[PDB]
Design a protein around this ligand. Sequence first.
Ligand SMILES: [Zn+2]
Ligand SMILES: [Zn+2]
Lengths: 330, 330
Amino acid sequence: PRIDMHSHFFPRISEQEAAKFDANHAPWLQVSAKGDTGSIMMGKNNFRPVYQALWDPAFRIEEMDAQGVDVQVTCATPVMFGYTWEANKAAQWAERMNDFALEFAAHNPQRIKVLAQVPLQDLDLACKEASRAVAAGHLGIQIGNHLGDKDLDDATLEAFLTHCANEDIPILVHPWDMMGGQRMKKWMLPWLVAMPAETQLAILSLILSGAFERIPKSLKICFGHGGGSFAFLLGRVDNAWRHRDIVREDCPRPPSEYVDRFFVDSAVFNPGALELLVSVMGEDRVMLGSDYPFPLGEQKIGGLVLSSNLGESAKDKIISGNASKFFNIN
Amino acid sequence: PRIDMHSHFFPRISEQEAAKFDANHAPWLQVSAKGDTGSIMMGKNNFRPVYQALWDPAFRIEEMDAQGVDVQVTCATPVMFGYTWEANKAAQWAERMNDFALEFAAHNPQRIKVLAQVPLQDLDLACKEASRAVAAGHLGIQIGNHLGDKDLDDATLEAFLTHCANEDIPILVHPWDMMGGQRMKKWMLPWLVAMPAETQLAILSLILSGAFERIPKSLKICFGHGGGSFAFLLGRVDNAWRHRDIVREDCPRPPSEYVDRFFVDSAVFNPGALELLVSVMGEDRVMLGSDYPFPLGEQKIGGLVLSSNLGESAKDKIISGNASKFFNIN
Ligand SMILES: [Zn+2]
Ligand SMILES: [Zn+2]
C-alpha cells in the first residue's frame, strides 16, 4: 500500500462565514467563474488561486486512484493557521477548521486521514484543541515552524510538543510566514530559499537548545520538505559545535546524533538529495510526502522514491511502513 | 601541490588609522594583553576576538607548512567591506585595504595570493578599484553576496560581474550581513542557517533572473561554503521552474543547467555533502577552501577532500588543479 502524509486541504468556507471571525483576515474560498478554479480570499482581496482538488474530496479520491495513493494524510493550508489572531477567536477558528477537516475525511475516512491545527498563541488553548481533535478522529497536529520571533526552542513551543509527546499525538512541522524582508520578491524565492531555511532553523532550534534532552523520547515529530536544508548542512553544524563553546552551551552531544528523535518527509525532488537524506536520517525516518495539490509539489506522487536505487525494503518503509507506524494507520 | 583558495586576513590597522575614515564604523585591530590574542574593534567597542594567524603572515606561513598548504589565497574579512559608507570614503578604504593585502602577501608572494575588495555601493568606483587592484598583483575580487536589498540580479551588481568578466578578473562571492531579524540570537544560528541561505539566494538570483544569459561565459565566479544549500535544494528549484510560469519568466532553461557557469569551494564539512556537491557541480568546479583561520573553518585543511572516495584524478583537481586554472597560479 501507499501513504502520502503531506498534503493540504482548504474548506468550502463562505465569505459570510469568514466575516464572522474577521472580515479582513479570515480566509475564505471563492469557487467561481467555472467551478474548477478557486481563489483563497481575504476580505475582498484575492490571495492565491487554487484548484479543485484542494477542496473537493470526491475529485481528490479520483486523482488519488490515478496516482495510486491508497491513504493520504492531509491538513490545513498554512494561511488558515491564524497565529496572529486574538487567542479565544483563534481557538474557535481552529475548532471549526478541524471539524471541516473531519468533514472532508468523512467522505472516505479509510483513505483520507486528517491532522489538526491549534491556536498556538495560547498554550492552554492549544493543548486542549490538540487533545480534542485527536479524540474526534484526527491522527495528529500540524503547526507552523515558528510563532513570530519565538522559534521551537521557546519554552511555550517546547511545552506544546511535550504535551503531544505525553499523549501519543504526532506532529507535522511546516514552514510558514517566511523570513526575508523585502529581498525575495521574484521567482518564488521565498519558497526556494526561505522555506527550507525556516525548516532547518526549526530543527536546529530544538537540537541546539537541548530541547530533545527535555522532550520525552515518545515525541513523534516530522518536518516538511525533507527537513529543508538541514541534512545537507549538518556537517557544518557539527563542525561549529566542536569549535565554539557558545554552540555547545545547551547541547551536550554532537548535533547530528539527534536525528533519532524526529522524522522528515521525502519531498526533495532529486535522487541524490533523497539518497543523502536517507543516509542522514535512516530508512526508518523518511516518509513519502508530496505537498499535493500544490504546484511546487510532486506531480507523480512517490515517483522519486520508487525510481531510486534504495533497497526495496527501504522503498517500502518510506512509501508505507514508516507512516503506518508514525500515524497508526492500517 | 595544494591551494587553499578561501581564507581571510585582517590588517594591523591602528585605532588612529581607522578613526581617520570613521571612528564609529571603521574596524581596527587590537593585538593586546599577550599579543597572540587580538580583537577586531569598532570605535571603542570590541566586535570579535581573533587569533594571530589572521594578521601575522610569518606565523601563518608556519601553520601553512604544518597543514601542508603550498599556496593560500586570502582576502578581506567581511567586516572590512564598508558597503554602508559614503562612496568616495569607501573607495579610499578599499584602496588602503588592498594595499595592506599586497603588503601581507609580499612576505611570501609565491605562497600567499590576495583578492581585493571594492566599494560596491558605486559601480564606477568599484570597477576602477577592481582593475587597479588586479594590475597591482591581486588575483581577483571578493565581494559580499548582497548590497542591502539589492541581490546579485540587480543591474548594478550584474554590471560589476560583467566588467570583471570582460577583464579576466575572477570573483569570490561571500555571504555577509545576514538576513534574519531578531530570530537567530543563539548558538551562532546566523552562521548555520542564514549564511548558507544567503549564498543560495545569490546563486538563484543570478540563475532565475537570467543573468547568465547576459553575463559573458568568460566570468569566473565562485561561491563560498559549497554554495550554501544551493546544490541540495536544486531539484526543488527545477521542480518549481517546471510548474510555475512566474519562476520561468526570466530563466529560459532549467536552473540546474547553469552549474557550468560558476564554481564553489569544497567547505561543506561532510563526505556525503561533498559527494553530492561534486555530483552536481562536476569535479572541475569545486576548489579546496577552508575558511582559515576562523573556528567554523576546516581545522585539518583539505582533510575532507583527501579522505573521500573520489577518484584520485578528482581529488587532484579540487585540491590544486581547479584553483590553478581559476586564479592563474603556478
Ligand atoms: Zn505543504
Ligand atoms: Zn569566509
